[PDB]
Design a protein around this nucleic acid. Sequence first.
DNA 1: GACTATGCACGTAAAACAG
DNA 2: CTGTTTTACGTGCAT
DNA 3: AGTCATTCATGACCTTGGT
DNA 4: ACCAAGGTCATGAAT
Lengths: 432, 433, 196, 198
Amino acid sequence: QNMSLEDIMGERFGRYSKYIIQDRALPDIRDGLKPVQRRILYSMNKDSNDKSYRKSAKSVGNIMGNFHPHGDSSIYDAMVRMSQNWKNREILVEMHGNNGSMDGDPPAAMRYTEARLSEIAGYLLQDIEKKTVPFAWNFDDTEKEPTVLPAAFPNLLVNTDIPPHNLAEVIDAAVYMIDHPTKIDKLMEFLPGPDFPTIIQGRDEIKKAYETGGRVVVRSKTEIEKLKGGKEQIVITEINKANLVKKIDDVRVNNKVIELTELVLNYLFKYTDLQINYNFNMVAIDNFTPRQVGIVPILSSYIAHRREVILARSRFDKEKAEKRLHIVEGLIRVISILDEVIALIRASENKADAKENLKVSYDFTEEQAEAIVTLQLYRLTNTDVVVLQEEEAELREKIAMLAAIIGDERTMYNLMKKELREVKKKFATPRL
Amino acid sequence: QNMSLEDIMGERFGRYSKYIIQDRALPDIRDGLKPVQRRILYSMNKDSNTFDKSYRKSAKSVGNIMGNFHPHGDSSIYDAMVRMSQNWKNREILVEMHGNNGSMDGDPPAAMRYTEARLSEIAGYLLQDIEKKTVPFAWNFDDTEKEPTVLPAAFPNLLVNTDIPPHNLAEVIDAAVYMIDHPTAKIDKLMEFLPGPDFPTIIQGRDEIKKAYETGKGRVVVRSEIEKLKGGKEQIVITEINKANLVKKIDDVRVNNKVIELNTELVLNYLFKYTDLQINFNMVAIDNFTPRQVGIVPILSSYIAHRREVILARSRFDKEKAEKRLHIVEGLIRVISILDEVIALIRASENKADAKENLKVSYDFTEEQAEAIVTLQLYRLTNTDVVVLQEEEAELREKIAMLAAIIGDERTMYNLMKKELREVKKKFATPRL
Amino acid sequence: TPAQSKNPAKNELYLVEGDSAGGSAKQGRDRKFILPLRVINTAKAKMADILKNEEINTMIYTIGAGVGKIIIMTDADTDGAHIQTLLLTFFYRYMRPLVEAGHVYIALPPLYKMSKGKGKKEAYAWTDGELEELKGATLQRYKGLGEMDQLWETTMNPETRTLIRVTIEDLARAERRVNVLMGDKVEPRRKWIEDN
Amino acid sequence: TPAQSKNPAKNELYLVEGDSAGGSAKQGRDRKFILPLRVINTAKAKMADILKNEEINTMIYTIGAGVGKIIIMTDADTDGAHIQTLLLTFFYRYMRPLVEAGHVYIALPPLYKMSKGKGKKEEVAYAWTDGELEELKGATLQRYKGLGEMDQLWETTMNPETRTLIRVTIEDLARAERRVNVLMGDKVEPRRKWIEDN
DNA sequence: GACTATGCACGTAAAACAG
DNA sequence: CTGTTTTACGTGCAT
DNA sequence: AGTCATTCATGACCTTGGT
DNA sequence: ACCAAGGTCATGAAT
Ligand SMILES: N[C@@H]1CCN(c2c(F)cc3c(=O)c(C(=O)O)cn(C4CC4)c3c2Cl)C1
Ligand SMILES: N[C@@H]1CCN(c2c(F)cc3c(=O)c(C(=O)O)cn(C4CC4)c3c2Cl)C1
C-alpha cells in the first residue's frame, strides 16, 4: 500500500544524522589522513607499487571499486593532490607530467597521468604487513580494509585545518615527549612553528596556538636589486601564485600605491595578498569522534596510539616465532627417529592415517605432525642435523627479545626512538 | 642543431602510411571482432569474470583493459564496451551489463562510475580455448603481459554479428556444417541454410541477398499491424535501426498532414517508405593479415580453415601435456619396484641436487623423471599408486593415441568441429528471425 | 528535460538523483501516468539568489503552483541523504502546502538482494532485521539509485515502498529544521550533533 | 587560450596535441621566447565551412598573415600522425609561404628511454627505438606512450629543437597532385589506391 | 557527468539552384 | 512551382 | 577533456548601505 | 566621498 508516513520533524532529523556521521570521515589524529586517502594509499600498497610507474585508470579504478564507493574523479582528483609536492611536505605519491602548476594548471585525466607510491609514503604503511593496525571489512564485503594506517611518519602534524611542519621538528619533539611525557614552551623549542613547502610572523601567536587549538602571518620570497641603467628591481621568484601574479599587475593598472620608495612594497604586500596568511585551527578525530587538539594533544594521542602499534608488531612477530620454533624443535627431534618415521609413514595407509599414527615414536602434535608428513623427499637430506639444532636458540632468542618488548615500558620507547630517528635520516626533511 | 629537413612530398606520405596501417585494425574475418574488442573480451577473461561469477564494476574492468592491453583513452575503451551490452545491437551480446545499458531511444548510458557488468555465456564460446596454445599470441604494448591476436572463437561471431549484417548462430552453424563435409558448394544451396541476415530488431530483397552473398556488396530492404479502435475507427501502430528518429518522424508526418491508433491503408504504405519507418550489406574485412572484401562463401571459407588450425592446436598441446604426464607416471610406477632402495638412496645423497643425479643407478630415469621422484613429498610414500598408476599407463596413453589421431585424420577432425558447433547451436541455440 | 507526461489526474512527478538515475527512470518508466536533479540550502542565501538557481527554478517551472504525487528518489549514500535534506527543505520554506497536503513525498529505495543459480535466475528494504528472513546461495548490497526493468521493482507498483511527508508537522518544528539543514550560524549545528 | 608571448624576434609558436600536452608545454615552457589543438581536412568542405571551424580559425587568429618557428608537436600514436597530416595540409592549401619559407615545421618527439637505480636517478633517452635503441640486462627500459607523460618535457623543449624537422623543403609542383590523392580524401578510389605500397 | 567538434565512408534523406 | 546537384545528417572507434 | 554549479566552515578580502 | 554591515570568493572531498 502507501506504506507509512512520518514527520519532517522526523525525516529531516534522521537523514541529516546519517550525513553528519559521514562528516566523521575526517583526518584521524593518528594516521593523519582522510579515508579517501587511507584507501588510496593502501590500494597502491596491496597492488605492489622501488617498482615502475603504474598508469592511472587502473590504480584509481582499483581504488575506486574495491575500497571506495564514490565516483572516480573524487578518488583520483584527490590522488593527484598527493602528487603536488608544493601542497604537502612529504608527497605520499609521486606522479609525472603534468602534476600541476603553482598557477591555474588543470592536470590531465586518468587517460594520461601515471604514478606510483613514494618512499616516505611507505613509512606510514610500513607494518600493515603483520596484524599491526586494527582492520575491518570492505563495503562490498569483498576484501578487507585498514582503519587508519599505523604510520611511522607523524603525517598528522607534518601535513578543521592542520598546518604543515617538518618531519625533523616532528620526530625531534616526538622523542622529547616520550622520555619526558609531562610544557608547550619547551616543546616549541623543537618546533618553533609549522613549515610550509613554499618566513612566518606571529611567534607569540603560534606559541598560544599550540595549546589553544589562532592566527599567524606569512611573507614572500622576494628581495631587492638594482637594474641596469640605474633603477629599481625588486621581484619575487600554502598560497596560490595564480591570483598573486595578477594582483601585482592589478596594482599597476590603477597605479594606486616587478623589476621597475621601498615603503611602497610594504604597503602592497599587505594589500595585494602578496603576503597574507595564515590561520592555524588544529582539529580532527580522536577516540573515534570529532575533537579539537593542539601541539601537545597531537603528539599525545599519536605516542600512545603508536605505542599500541609497536606492541602489536611484537604480538604477531613473537607469535610467528613461537610457531616456528615449535615446528623446528619438532623437526630436529625427528632426526633421531628419522629411520623409524620414514618407515612408519610408508605402512601408514592414507595420508590422514599417517599423521595420527604419529602418536608413537614421539608425543608430537598436529602442527608437529603436519610438517613431518609434508617434509617432502628432498629434505630427507638430514642437513638439519646440526643446523636445526642452532635454530632452537636462534628463533628462541627472537622469542625472548619480542616478549621483552611486551613487558618493558622503557625499552619499548627506545624502539620507537631508534625508528623515528631513522626516518629523520632516511627521509630527513631540510629546515624551513 | 636544426636537425635535417624533408619533403612534405616526403613527410605527408610516410605519416599517413602509419595511420593507414592502423586502418588495418578492422574486424578479422575469423574472430569477428575489432581489436579494441578482442582486447576487451580477453581483459574480462584473464580477470575471471565468466557468466558464472558475480558482476564486476567498470572503472576497474575498463581501467584494466585500458592500461594493460589498450593504449588509447578510457571512454573509447568502455564506450565500446557498453556497445557489447546492447542486445538490441548484436545477436549474442558478448557482455551482460545491468542498470542503464541504453534505450532504443536517445539514452545516454552512465559513466564507469555507475555501470557494472561481466562476461556472457555465449561470450565464452569465442574465448573457449585460449586456455592452451590455441590461437597465436603476441606481446603487450608496454611489453608487460602478452596478448592474443584474435580469439579462436567457436561461435562464428563474424557472420553472426566495411559492414557485416547480423545473422543467427543457427543458420550459421547449420551452413558451417554443410561447408565442411561439402567444401565445393554453390551459394544457391548454401542460402538454403541462411536465407539471409537476421536482425535482433522482415527483410525484402531475396534476389538481392542471393547475389550479395557472392558479390560482397548490395542492397536489401527492411519492414517494421492493424486493428480497430473503440467507437469505430482505425488503430494501426508499431510496438538495425533507431527508434529515436522514427518516433518523431511519424509525429512530423502528422504536423504537416501531407500524407498511431488514429482512412486508407494505402496511406501507411506511402509513409513507410518516406518517413524512414521501413528503410545495405557490404561485406568486408581482413584476411591473411590484410584488407579484402569477402562474401557468404569466403567467410565460412577462411573461418573453416582458420578454425581447423584452431582445433589442431588444441590437439598439439593437450597431446603434448598427456605425453608429459604419462612419462612422469610410467616413471613414478617403476619407482614403486625400488621404492625401498630409492628412499634409501635419497637419504644418503648429500644435497638435493646430488640426489637426482645420483639417480643414475637403480634405473635409467630422466631429469623430468628424477625431478618428480625427488619432490614426491613424504605423504605420497603411501604406495596407493601401486595398482592405480598401473591403470594410468593405459589411461593417459589412450588420450595420447586419441589426440594424435585428430592430427592424422582429415575426416575425423571435421567430426570434432561438427559435434562442437552443433553443441553451441543447442547450448546457445538462437531462435529464428 | 523531464520525461514527458499525460493527464493531471493523479499528478505524479518523480525526482531522481543525477542524470543516470533520471535516465534509468525515464527509459524504465514502468510507471509514468521524471526529472533529473544534479540543490541549494534554501535558507542559505537571498531569495533572489535562490531564483537564480537552475535547480530551484527548474522545479518551480515544472508544475506551476509558485510561491503562492511529486515523489523524490534518493539512494542510501549518506551522500544520498543531504540530497533528501535540501529537497524537503526546498519543498518546505517554499511550496508549504505541497507537502502540507502530503501529495508529494519521499521514496524508499531497496537495500540487500539475494540471487543464486548461475543461469537459473531466481529483494529487501532493510538489510538489518529484514535481511535475516532471507550459505549455498549468494547475497548482494545496493550501491545507490544507480544499478537496478528492475528499476521498476520500486517503480511499477504504486510506490510499494513510498514515504508520506510532513505528516502532522506542526509548528516549533520549523525551529528545528532551521537548526539543522538551513545551516544556522555554526554554533547550533555543532550542537544538534549532541545525539550522534 | 595560447601560452603568452614576448617579442616577434624569432617568432616561435608551438602547437601541441590536446589540452594535456599544451598544458605540459605551457607550464613547462623551458623555451618560450604555446597553443592546444583539439583539425578538419582542409580540402574536405567549403572554404566557408573551414572558416567556421574554431580549430582552423584559432590558428588563423594567432599570428595574422591570413590567406594572403611555428612548430607542431604530435606524439607517436599512429593517431598522432593523422594530426600531423591535417596540420601540414592546413598549412599548405592555406598559408603556403609559411612552410614554403620553412620557418614553421614539425617536431620529433622521443621514443624509448632507459633508467635504473631505485632512488639513484640516472636516466637516458633516444629518438628511434629501432637502430638507435641498440646503442643503449641489469637496468630497465621504457617506451613512450605519447606527447603525454614526459621538466622532462623540455628535453625536447629547452634546447632549440634538438630534434626538429624542417618542412616543405623543395616541395615543388606535382606534389600538390599527391597530397590531394592521400590526405584531402579525394573520392575514395584514389585513397584505396595509394595504399598499394602499404 | 552530460555538454560541446572532428576523421573516416558510405548511404540517402533534405537545402538551394534557375526564371 | 519541377526536377536537378548540391548539402547535411548519422553511425563506431579514435583524439 | 576541459566546461559548466554547490555543500559544507571559515576566514580575509571587495560590494553596497546611508546623505 | 567617510566608516559600517553586508556580500563574495577559495578551498578539498563528495554529488
Ligand atoms: N566538444 C569536444 C571536442 C573535443 N572533445 C573531446 C575531448 F577533448 C576529449 C575526449 C576524451 O578524452 C575521451 C576519452 O578517451 O576518454 C573520449 N571523448 C569522446 C567520447 C566523448 C573526448 C571528446 Cl568528444 C569534444
Ligand atoms: N552543475 C554542475 C557542473 C559541474 N558538475 C559536475 C557533475 F555533474 C558531476 C561530477 C562527477 O561526477 C565527478 C566524479 O567524481 O566523477 C567529479 N566532478 C567534479 C570534479 C569535476 C563532477 C561535476 Cl563538477 C555539474
